[PDB]
Subunit: 330 residues, 4 copies
């Protein structure tokens, strides 16, 4: 008997992991500049753990991530599932938490899908990207990683795609699953998993994007003192399918915003209450009678995460109570 | 001789601490031990949910504290928790009275099991009565902790421990009616700022737009079309902008709208010298000021100047 | 059909939850002074949710918790399992994280066992104990709480007995599962569970204390700069069955401590390396050759938690590799 | 004119940053960009794993910095991460040079993927070269953050982000070779302390005992039997003691041993006025000093006084 290593496919999309600047010790850089081959060759130990094939899907900053790249990724992974043993997606950190949840809801492939990025560009002193990439490959190669949904691997930690969020603007340790914690930690190329997400993911969801050319239009409005209703009116005037509110506190709304959203809701615009507050649920049965206004409470989904689920909910139903049930199950 | 207690004024604005329905007099009467530490007088300013806080109320409060500073030894403001962090920083920048100003709220209703409001109110008075609390800026006192009004933010939607100074930490902790202060904010506040709202009846209009994958430019454009004085971007990561939002804001910054890049990310600074050439576009980087805190400072900046470089310096000093 | 509420048994042991002082606004108080009936009557809403029966097992500060109280609790719960639908144990906060893990490893009852305490005495302004008790009863009454091991409920949060730890000396929010997160959050008397512990617990462990009169002797030594080997020598001289080291960093030992523990280990004293560092695992394959010295690495178990598992491991085996396997499974 | 760079001295002590095997000269030569910010000179003090740090090394370091203060513009100490928090606070209390003293280490070996040591060393030099870093006490620089030597502690066994000032927060963050300081420690340090180790060759013996359910009194008794000068208790919760440990320590405190109650709990103060009457027993409460930090302060306290009340006041001031 001979040892054979798993086959792992790297789908590259850009990010600071592929960023470069002209100095190792200045901060300035350009994103999504370096190709997948360069990233792979910067981690010569990858041969110890996997047979790696790299594909460049796009090369962008994830600040410019969009619905089309999401559809491209989901369809590619679902199509290519039988060709490989696992996937790593290199991506910008800014919207990784959004792409990861989208994929968590739409990947039907039963093989690990692991997202990874870097907070320092590839050119920087002590760049984090090479070890992050190694650890993402370790996770994608570990049989125990299966059936846990779509994962994010950053800073030696395996995080579920639903709860994971970027907590700090600059810190290499930025990614945390702030409400329910990580799934496992990586030490010396091994993972000790102690958790798995309960919410339904991947092959257990009804969302099937195989034939979609686009996704429903869902925007986000922010609340604060003296908030303008103009953003909300703009989305309503454009015929948006859904609006997510980044509420204050427990999903609360400035009154003018509340008035515009209540009206939209009774015309069939889906309205989800989420929170600008970085941890905790936007609950039912607090200060807003959701049943009365036809609103949906986001639970622990932050506004950008709630957008992901709402867009997908709107491919199935426009009924607020059915949308609320979706927000209680996925 | 005869022992004497400080005179503390409670300015009530509403909130769950008053659940925004119970009056200042009932709040006070419900914590009879306040008599052990101060001579409390209450005045009702408004009685609202802080999700409906607004510029008018802010102006009322700053004017009242500045006017009444001589009459009292310190102030406590009872407020909703939802926008307490905004009001705190507004007052931090506009209050000229060097005597303690302490804001407090509650996460649980006064009738709920283990309501937090009573002890929160007690400790806010302790803080307002402590001579060591002077000259530290406007404060927030919650969950046995004294927090500076610049850094303090609501971190959790329901936890009594929600309020934290997430970038630089608290100033001190309160135990047995005493505070051990170990920090003070270095940014200029109160009487060391140029902001003076004594004669203003309105504040520059400043709105906030959110960034996310596939973000619409419609919110940003709606603010521009209404002639907003300023727009704060709740950027992704280190204050980055979705392309269409970036395009709209680039235009606004050369067309009479001040533009500040902040971040939806809950901790850390939005820096210069990363991916965005702020100088080229005429944008301002917010540093550790989150979008709603950056709005506050940007409205006050626009009372002095419309020049992006002078705005950037304000954002580096206050 | 008529609604019937679950039967819940409160086993009271003391703590600040049962503490009292002479003023509502001074900090001074005496622990474990108030009886179970008083605690129950301070939460008049408990009738809305359960039929509550209180038993006083002991009335102590949990700083004086000990092996005999642990054995008493485990045997009582296992004996009385069929008499009730769920248990709440009122307890001091100082060692709750130790009792909870002991119970997590030794309870064979398939009904929820929920531990609760209070950081402020019963006499204090804004005392946390009454709502903590309510929420513990809610958790013990929820069918979904079953099969999750022994739980700790504090500050609106349901925490697993293994990972839970006291993080702050004074804060009502002190209890966190610092490595893997909470299992669920409580809002308006309802729990949305999103996690369950993977490590084996309760009826899935081999530990059976039904007939034990005592537990193996296990002590803890602390490392720091210029550490004394005298504590370690004292435990060895007394014939201790086990010693847990609160190491520096990743389970590292001051050399004189290391020398004494290496010697003890080769005479059959079990030696577990843990860490004084509050989060993260004490790993294998770092600076200490555990295989060589016959040591066991504690993983994420902190020193007092590692003591619990080691005592129980020593009821089954004295073999270091079998003990290491136990530390990898429970 | 001609631009001039500060002179910075690296004092090397070992650690994973040197993995304790590589010499100061290789460390320095591996970050050639240090030349852009300083004139670096290195000196080897020892080359050890900091799990074997000891009083002798502490005394060497304090004496060397105090002696060499005039010769340089700032210091960086390369050190293991395991006891860096102890050495930092020792130096914080004993260094009399008001010029920046910055400690640094690394969580990953220099040969590992994405090793942290190089940028950590670069930023430690930035900090040591910043004129704004003077008069803030001894510092720890890790993961782009400037932390005070009193509050800083290792929070995680392996994370590069492990070091945090868990009670009062960091002093500033480092970005693009610049620091925005927003805090400074209020406790007295360096030249405002009475501790002077210039002529000492040994320090008072102080040991640490741990509390847990069913704790043995054997460790505490072993320290007492050896005539230890002081014992720090790593208490449960708010510095509480298992009965048998409490009994032994009560006796020690009246029998020539200073006793400080600290806590195994990683954050928060061990306070007076909770369950233990410190005055009655002659114990000292540690405040926010964890057991190993309390040991440091208690050894230095015992160089001035053996009186528990004077020790308590030291613990309230430094
Ligand atoms: N703007 C970059 C930031 C990063 O990757 O860290 C991106 O998200 O693509
Ligand atoms: N919505 C309430 C929440 C609270 O006070 O806790 C307020 O901000 O007025
Ligand atoms: N010493 C008390 C502290 C508390 O319960 O909060 C105990 O653990 O019993
Ligand atoms: N044991 C090493 C750990 C490190 O430096 O990271 C030391 O403290 O010397």
């Amino acid at each position: 008997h001979h040892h054979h290593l798993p086959n792992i496919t790297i789908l590259a999309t850009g990010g600071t992991i592929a960023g470069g600047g002209d100095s190792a010790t200045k901060s300035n850089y350009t994103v999504g500049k370096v190709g997948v081959e360069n990233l792979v060759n910067a981690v010569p130990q990858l041969k110890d753990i996997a047979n790696v094939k790299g594909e460049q899907v796009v090369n962008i900053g994830s600040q410019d991530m969009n619905d089309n790249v999401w559809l491209t990724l989901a369809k590619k992974i679902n199509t290519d599932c039988d060709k490989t043993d696992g996937f790593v997606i290199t991506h910008g950190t800014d919207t990784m938490e959004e792409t990861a949840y989208f994929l968590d809801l739409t990947v039907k492939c039963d093989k690990p899908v692991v997202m990874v990025g870097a907070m320092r560009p590839s050119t920087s002193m002590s760049a984090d990207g090479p070890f992050n990439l190694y650890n993402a490959v370790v996770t994608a190669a570990d049989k125990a990683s299966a059936n846990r949904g779509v994962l994010v691997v950053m800073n030696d930690t395996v995080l579920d795609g639903r709860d994971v969020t970027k907590t700090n603007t600059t810190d290499v340790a930025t990614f945390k699953s702030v409400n329910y914690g990580p799934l496992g930690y990586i030490h010396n190329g091994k993972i000790d998993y102690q958790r798995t997400p309960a919410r339904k993911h991947t092959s257990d969801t009804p969302f099937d994007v195989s034939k979609l050319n686009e996704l429903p239009k869902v925007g986000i409005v922010y609340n604060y003192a003296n908030a303008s209703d103009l953003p909300a009116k703009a989305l309503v005037d454009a015929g948006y399918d859904g609006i997510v509110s980044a509420g204050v506190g427990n999903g609360n709304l400035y009154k003018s915003v509340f008035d515009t959203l209540a009206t939209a809701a009774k015309t069939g615009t889906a309205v989800v209450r989420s929170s600008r507050v970085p941890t905790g649920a936007t609950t039912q049965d607090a200060e807003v009678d959701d049943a009365k206004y036809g609103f949906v409470a986001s639970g622990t989904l932050n506004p950008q995460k709630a957008r992901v689920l709402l867009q997908l909910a709107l491919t199935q139903t426009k009924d607020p109570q059915q949308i609320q049930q979706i927000f209680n199950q996925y």
